[PDB]
Amino acid sequence: MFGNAFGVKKRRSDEAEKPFWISYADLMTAMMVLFLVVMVASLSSVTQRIQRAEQGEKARGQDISRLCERLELHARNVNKNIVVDCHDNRISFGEAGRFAHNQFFLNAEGQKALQDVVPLVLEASNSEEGKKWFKQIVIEGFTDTDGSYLYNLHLSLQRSEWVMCSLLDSRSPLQKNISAEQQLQIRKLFLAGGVSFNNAKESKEASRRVELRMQFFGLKDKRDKADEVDFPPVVNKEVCQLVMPL
Amino acid sequence: MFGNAFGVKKRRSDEAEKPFWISYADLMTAMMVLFLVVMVASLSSVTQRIQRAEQGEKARGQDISRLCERLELHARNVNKNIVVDCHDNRISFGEAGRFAHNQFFLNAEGQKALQDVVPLVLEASNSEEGKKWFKQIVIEGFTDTDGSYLYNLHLSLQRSEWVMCSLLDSRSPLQKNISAEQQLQIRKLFLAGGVSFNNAKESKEASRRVELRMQFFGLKDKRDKADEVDFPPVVNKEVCQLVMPL
Amino acid sequence: MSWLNSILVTLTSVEPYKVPVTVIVTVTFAFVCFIFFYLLRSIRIIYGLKKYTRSINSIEKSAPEVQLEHLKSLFQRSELKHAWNEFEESLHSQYELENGEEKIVRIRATAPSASFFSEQQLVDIPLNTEFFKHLPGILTGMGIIGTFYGLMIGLNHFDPSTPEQVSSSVNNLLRDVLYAFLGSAFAIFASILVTWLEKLSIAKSYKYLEKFTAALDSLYDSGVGEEYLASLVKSSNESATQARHLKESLVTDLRDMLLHLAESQKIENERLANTLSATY
Amino acid sequence: MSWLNSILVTLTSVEPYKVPVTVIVTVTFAFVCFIFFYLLRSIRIIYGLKKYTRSINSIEKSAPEVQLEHLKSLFQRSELKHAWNEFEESLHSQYELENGEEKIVRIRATAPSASFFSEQQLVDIPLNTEFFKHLPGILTGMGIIGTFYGLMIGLNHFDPSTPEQVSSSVNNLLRDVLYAFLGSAFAIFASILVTWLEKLSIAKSYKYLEKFTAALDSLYDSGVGEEYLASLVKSSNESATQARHLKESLVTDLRDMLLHLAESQKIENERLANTLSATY
Amino acid sequence: MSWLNSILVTLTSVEPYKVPVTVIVTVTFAFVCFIFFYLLRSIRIIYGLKKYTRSINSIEKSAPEVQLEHLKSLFQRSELKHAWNEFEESLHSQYELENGEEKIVRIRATAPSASFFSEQQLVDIPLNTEFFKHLPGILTGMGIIGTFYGLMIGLNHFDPSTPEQVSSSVNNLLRDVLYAFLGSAFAIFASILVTWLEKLSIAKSYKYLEKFTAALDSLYDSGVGEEYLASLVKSSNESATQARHLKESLVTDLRDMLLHLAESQKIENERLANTLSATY
Amino acid sequence: MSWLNSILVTLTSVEPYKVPVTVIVTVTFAFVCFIFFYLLRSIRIIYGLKKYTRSINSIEKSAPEVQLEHLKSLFQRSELKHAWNEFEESLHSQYELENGEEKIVRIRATAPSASFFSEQQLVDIPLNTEFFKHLPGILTGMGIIGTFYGLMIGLNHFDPSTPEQVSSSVNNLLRDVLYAFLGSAFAIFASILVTWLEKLSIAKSYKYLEKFTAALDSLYDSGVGEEYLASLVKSSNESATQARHLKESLVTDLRDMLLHLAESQKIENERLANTLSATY
Amino acid sequence: MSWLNSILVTLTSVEPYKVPVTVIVTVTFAFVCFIFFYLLRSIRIIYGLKKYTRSINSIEKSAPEVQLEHLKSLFQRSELKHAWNEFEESLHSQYELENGEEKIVRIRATAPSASFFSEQQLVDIPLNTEFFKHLPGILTGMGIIGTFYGLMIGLNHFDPSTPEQVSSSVNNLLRDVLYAFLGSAFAIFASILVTWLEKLSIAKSYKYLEKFTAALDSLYDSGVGEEYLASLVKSSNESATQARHLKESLVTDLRDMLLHLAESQKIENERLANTLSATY
Numbered sequence A, B: 001m002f003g004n005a006f007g008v009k010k011r012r013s014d015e016a017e018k019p020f021w022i023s024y025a026d027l028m029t030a031m032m033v034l035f036l037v038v039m040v041a042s043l044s045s046v047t048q049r050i051q052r053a054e055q056g057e058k059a060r061g062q063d064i065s066r067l068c069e070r071l072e073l074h075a076r077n078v079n080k081n082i083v084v085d086c087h088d089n090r091i092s093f094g095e096a097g098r099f100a101h102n103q104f105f106l107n108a109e110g111q112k113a114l115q116d117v118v119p120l121v122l123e124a125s126n127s128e129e130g131k132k133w134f135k136q137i138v139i140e141g142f143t144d145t146d147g148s149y150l151y152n153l154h155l156s157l158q159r160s161e162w163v164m165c166s167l168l169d170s171r172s173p174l175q176k177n178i179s180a181e182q183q184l185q186i187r188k189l190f191l192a193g194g195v196s197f198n199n200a201k202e203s204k205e206a207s208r209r210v211e212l213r214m215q216f217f218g219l220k221d222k223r224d225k226a227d228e229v230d231f232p233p234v235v236n237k238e239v240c241q242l243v244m245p246l
Numbered sequence C, D, E, F, G: 001m002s003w004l005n006s007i008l009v010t011l012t013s014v015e016p017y018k019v020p021v022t023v024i025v026t027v028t029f030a031f032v033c034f035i036f037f038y039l040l041r042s043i044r045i046i047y048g049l050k051k052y053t054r055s056i057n058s059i060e061k062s063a064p065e066v067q068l069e070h071l072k073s074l075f076q077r078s079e080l081k082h083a084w085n086e087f088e089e090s091l092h093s094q095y096e097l098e099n100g101e102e103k104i105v106r107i108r109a110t111a112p113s114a115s116f117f118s119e120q121q122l123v124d125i126p127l128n129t130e131f132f133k134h135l136p137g138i139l140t141g142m143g144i145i146g147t148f149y150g151l152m153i154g155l156n157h158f159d160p161s162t163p164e165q166v167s168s169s170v171n172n173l174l175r176d177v178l179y180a181f182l183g184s185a186f187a188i189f190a191s192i193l194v195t196w197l198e199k200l201s202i203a204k205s206y207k208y209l210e211k212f213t214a215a216l217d218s219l220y221d222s223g224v225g226e227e228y229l230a231s232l233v234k235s236s237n238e239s240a241t242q243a244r245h246l247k248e249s250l251v252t253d254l255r256d257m258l259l260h261l262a263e264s265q266k267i268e269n270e271r272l273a274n275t276l277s278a279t280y
């Protein structure tokens, strides 16, 4: 009967977010971040030696690729006969390097290409990339498994000896375009010898070929100085001992 | 003034809990646990790969060392002039391996030791260590730095060819001693390498020498039929190419 | 305890795909219940409130009896039937005398119509808002349970023995948690949608309930008790003044009547004197 | 500090399985207490409200005294006994003098039935809603405590210090995490189940209490003070009117009596004149 | 289930950068909707409330009829027309008969203006504050969905098969985590900004609504019912005293008039005696 | 700047154990403050309410005055003394003229006792529930801050510069995480315990305050205003007939008195005529 | 997308140390705004309330007019001035004739003092509690935002190209996580400090406002309307009795005057008889 019309009531005051839940979300996010970053740091620490070795391997690959590309660019510029396989470090003279049956010489193009490529490879080896990663050059010999074994071995050995003669025989056209230091460098960077058997090609005429396969230091080799030897200055011109007239 | 003091009260509907920060906190709890588990699992796994690679490399090295040790023990048991160096994987000849000027054949002791070491190498490759790691054997020629370079190369290469013949010549005792399978295995193992000129100490007696070294598969190397060149069965005897009046 | 290991291997033996499908099916059934019992119900409530408001606005100019009968015929849904009955109890009909009869000339309001057509009675109880406002939290909790269950399935099957086992176990754990989070994300999306739909529906229900009660309030005027008190005060003052005026008028009339009586008795005394003189 | 290290070795010394077991057992105890003190109690309240509503509907068309006696005998549970006593105090009994005695002809409402059969007194206090609406939060927090303490155990065991025993540390960590998440998931499941049950029960309690108070409100009509004020205003107006008419009627009666007195005086005067003439 | 496997494989193959873009687009759309439907409307409501308050404060010292006409004109072309109509119904106009015409001399408040210009019908319903207090949570839920999904994608792609693959796996994982963190940072920033803006605007709205309803209450005074009751009590006491004094005054007047009538009768009878003596 | 690095060197220089100890100490101090200022206070309030209910349930059969002085002497608290004074102001004492004096016969309640012995005045303000309902959030925040600070210490200690130092660094960081989690777990356990006790105390206090006010409400009866209005209406209705009957009785008495006056005049003037005739 | 990468480069381009600095400075600015706009105002309000309570308690034993003047001069703040005006016009002043002018002898309370000096009017709106109760959540959210932003900067600038680049990037990531921990710790610390200060201030404000309104409530008594109605009922009964007694007294005294008139007429007629006898 005598109620107060002016009695007021509090509004619909919705409460705030409970601070615990947002703080807990903050803490859980911080913990998730901590575990992520600790995993990243730990994995980067355990494998840092592996990472450094892989980086060095990639750098060696880049240097070798650059040197091979420079050498093959020089070959393309100078002589079309010289084709370079940078994938597996092979110098090929396919058409000019064919060997007929039971002979160890080559046509004129074989010698032209060989005596043309030797100075180019010497120049490549004399560069800083060569002075850091280039070892001596291996002459590749190939023989088939048919017939008498030792006849094929003797044929390949005579082919290698003929290649080395042609590189370092008197009156050769290369000898007229060479200096003493370059001749010494050829003597140091080249060894003649090596035989192999393979069945990766469809024709037996392919095995009758010669190739240049340069090989490089490993990452942990790093040009052991004690391995290098020395030769005296040339006192008399070299003479090939294979039977040229045959 | 006309209202009633006995009126309804508590007209206040409770506010519902805000659920989304709760979801955020619980999902980050799950994510934090996931990241912790991935952290520990990834660290353990990477460490296990690293130690597995290290112990595999160590086991391969130990197998190589055991093979070299047993081969050297067998060499001592057979005949004493053999010199085996496990530190560089090289079997050399102490004195019987010497050579004189314009000479291309080992002495009687040298030929005897060369014939004796072959079955030891066959047994070494036969064993489990040989099957697991043993590569083909190359033959390296060594000669002084003096004289004609082509003369030295031809002489050393002739020495290597004569050694290979004595390995596989029909008149040699090996052919009448070994079987067809042993002959094929020798064909697979023994290869001719290059010529080296490691001249030191001004000792021509020990500089001009030939020794055989064995190579081994790497940890990452793969064994496949492409590299496994199979010689056909022997259908005719082999006569060597360098005749005695040479 | 062996009981804990047994229940763990029992719980975690379910296929990891059965967690998201269970969460999705449960959340979808809760969503369908929400749609049927709250969204459709509130849409019907809003439509009915709009129709009732239109009906009430059409009797603004009618006579009090006619519009009272119209409103009595209008309200037949049980909650609004009771609400209208109590509201009409609150209305105060004022009668006047015309042609020697008591008929209603004006109906006055004593309480606002929102007191009887209240938000509770007409919206909150029908929509079960005391329950359905907590549904988003329930959906979120179901999603969280699904994610935790998937994580538990992935963790129970983890094998850290060998590195290959470690990698496969990590893949399986991530796959199980991914299934579970599919279910959980569905739950959170449904929670968002339910929150939006619920809040919008309740806001519009309150809006059109306010419009309906506003239409009902405009028919009847409040403030009748103060008018009655003012009328009583005026009547008291007039009664005092009229008491004095009637006393004065009665005194005047009494004086006039006694003067008339004195004149009449004087005339009769003269007549008696004349008769006595005649008898002499 | 020796104290804190001793505290850690004491906490982490418990077997990890006792953590989810403790969480599950205590949360199940909380759920059982909720069922006993809130759910079954609310079911009993709802059934009682329905039965009371049925009883009230049976006396819709009875005499006010019979209705009052039936309701007094009906309400005997303590809180509804007090609520009914207060509500009956709110009711206004209108008496009329019939057959020489005062009899209750009508009982009028002055306040709504909800003012005494309030949601608070009849639902919220008997069900302890001020506590139970916070129970789901307590359950979720208990699950969270189990989660921290289980991960503390797991992090404590993780200390391999040797590549050979890393697998065992990882396995133990996974097991402890699995225990912690089992506890947390069970706690969250129980919290959402409690939320479902309590909100559904409270909604139903409010709905049926609304029906009960609506049944009580339909017995008695309100608006009696305004009717009394209207009667007073009409009484004042007719009182002024009756006063003026009584004054006029008194004046008229006074005039009639005075003319009758004049006639009697005339009769006496003429008789005196006749007597004097006879004597003379 | 084949469908679940297809859904999982398609959800695993989603580009990681698309999840933050979706989060950003959806949160930006929600923010634009917030600005359009809440913030601009709240600004308009606040400006309108201030304009109304200035209009009300301009008639503080005006005549009551002019005040009523000004307020009716102010609120009649508005959505507050019915609220003003009810408030004016709650106003009690006191009348005094001046120069033979009934004129409004004072207007008395019988109810606060907050009961008609309520917060719900002026602020809460227009602004949809029921929903928009949940929008920060909605944005938080979008953020957690996007973040968990992105982190799951990142962990699924992270699998270093060899120790040489650790670097690339770490780099790609960090990129995926960066995308997930971008999404969450945007969503939570928008959540906090929405909270700040809408809380500040709702505080301003409540403040200016209070200023408005206080300006309305400042115009008119309350307590007229107690004044009427006090007047009635005084009038009753004065009426008892008045009745006693009117009775006494009527008695005195009647005594005086009867004495005068007796004197007149004595004079008339003395004249009769003189006439009788003259007749002798 | 260098300021940030300098402070980070400063903060992360403390031993990891000092942080859980600080968290435990501060949380325990806040829990003790809760127990003292809130729990014991609420227990004292509950026992006081129980004691007060017993006394009121003891004067239920005493005379209204004796009840009134008993209740006045019973309430000696500042909040309850003021509440009792206001409630007694709300009570309407009815006086009837007995033995020539005004004596209280009945005391009537005009407002419910809870309007003065309310929850805010008797529970919420004494217990500072506006503060203590937010204490658990404060406790959990303290724990989270301690956990964060311990995490900074642990992360500052973590630096695996060598592949062989990775396991030791990871284990030490997990130990620091263990410390931080210990702080958080204790804080959250204490917060849950505080929430449980605080909610239970509120529920008990509200229940017992309801019992107390119900005991107070039962002492006095309401509805005095409607009874007064019914009495006033009856008095006006009877007063109309009283005025009519008083007027009729006055007219009848005047008729009888004037008839007696006429008879007396007849007798007296007959005696006058006889005496005059005899003397003539 | 190009847009996403451009956004990432633009956002990440800031220095890592600017994120903790931004979080700390923004949180400190929010804290300073809280201190200036909430804490200092609340302290001023509490001090003013205590001073007003002392002033009101000093004026208890003064005359009603002096109390009104003192209280009118006391309240000068705009909200306090409006509240006092509303309360004063809710107060009922009782006037009595002492002895030639209207003098206030008592002032009665027709409404609680808290109806006008309410928490909403005097504390909640001036303190902007509708915004400031959500500030701690904003502070914690800014901490979370800083965490996410700092990690975004760390992750985007990760450079895996070279091993020492990896080492520097990992160091930057660790520093960024430490920075995020520091910012979160500071944000949560300021949030809980704001919560503590805010809740303590609001509780003290409610306590002292209750004391102040209790001081006002003690100055005046309630129940004036029931007393007026009781006076009216007693006056009606006494008026019935007085009307009957006045009729009885009037008829008795009229009988007396008519007997006196008859006796005077008899005596005067005896004198007339003597005169007539003297005539003869």
Ligand SMILES: CCCCCCCCCCCCCCCCCC(=O)OC[C@H](COP(=O)([O-])OCC(O)COP(=O)([O-])OC[C@@H](COC(=O)CCCCCCCCCCCCCCCCC)OC(=O)CCCCCCCCCCCCCCCCC)OC(=O)CCCCCCCCCCCCCCCCC
Residues within 6 Å of the ligand: C043, C046, C186, C189, C190, C192, C193, C196, C200, C201, C204, C207, E025, E026, E029, E030, E033, E034, E037, E128, E131, E138
């Ligand atoms: C770029 C896009 C990318 C992002 C996409 C996703 C977006 C996420 C954002 C999250 C939420 C933010 C929204 C903020 C704004 C809304 C606030 C509000 O209340 O607005 C006021 C306003 C109404 O109040 P008002 O201001 O007074 O307006 C005047 C009235 O219209 C007239 O006055 P009246 O009161 O007299 O009117 C009578 C009243 C009473 O009538 C009634 O009966 C209503 C009561 C019940 C309502 C029933 C409606 C049911 C509709 C079903 C679903 C429709 C679409 C759902 C979309 C989600 C699915 C993916 O009628 C209504 O109010 C009905 C209008 C409501 C329907 C809105 C139109 C439908 C969709 C909008 C079309 C535009 C496209 C935008 C993008 C689409 C999204 C992909 O509502 C709107 O118009 C809102 C529309 C804006 C967009 C809404 C988007 C939906 C959000 C749902 C969450 C998504 C979750 C994903 C689901 C997946 C599950 C697995």
Ligand SMILES: CCCCCCCC/C=C\CCCCCCCC(=O)OC[C@H](COP(=O)(O)OCCN)OC(=O)CCCCCCC/C=C\CCCCCCCC
Residues within 6 Å of the ligand: C178, C179, C181, C182, C183, C185, E008, E010, E011, E013, E014, E015, E018, E019, E022, E023, E026, E142, E143, E145, E146, E149
């Ligand atoms: C409204 C949501 C609120 C907040 C949500 C936060 C983030 C959650 C979401 C989502 C995924 C990102 C959206 C991507 C849309 C792009 C569509 C398009 O343009 O192309 C059409 C596309 C062709 O592209 P693909 O062949 O798939 O390219 C593969 C490259 N690796 O074909 C289609 O028809 C559509 C395919 C859909 C792909 C994304 C599916 C996402 C669906 C729902 C998301 C729900 C949350 C995620 C939970 C995951 C738990 C397992």
Ligand SMILES: [Ca+2]
Residues within 6 Å of the ligand: C109, C217, C218, C219, C220, C221, C222, E086, E089
């Ligand atoms: Ca109206």
Ligand SMILES: [Ca+2]
Residues within 6 Å of the ligand: C085, C086, C089, D109, D217, D218, D219, D220, D221, D222
């Ligand atoms: Ca009713």
Ligand SMILES: [Ca+2]
Residues within 6 Å of the ligand: E109, E217, E218, E219, E220, E221, E222, G085, G086, G089
């Ligand atoms: Ca005012």
Ligand SMILES: [Ca+2]
Residues within 6 Å of the ligand: D086, D089, F109, F217, F218, F219, F220, F221, F222
């Ligand atoms: Ca009572």
Ligand SMILES: [Ca+2]
Residues within 6 Å of the ligand: F086, F089, G109, G217, G218, G219, G220, G221, G222
């Ligand atoms: Ca008081």
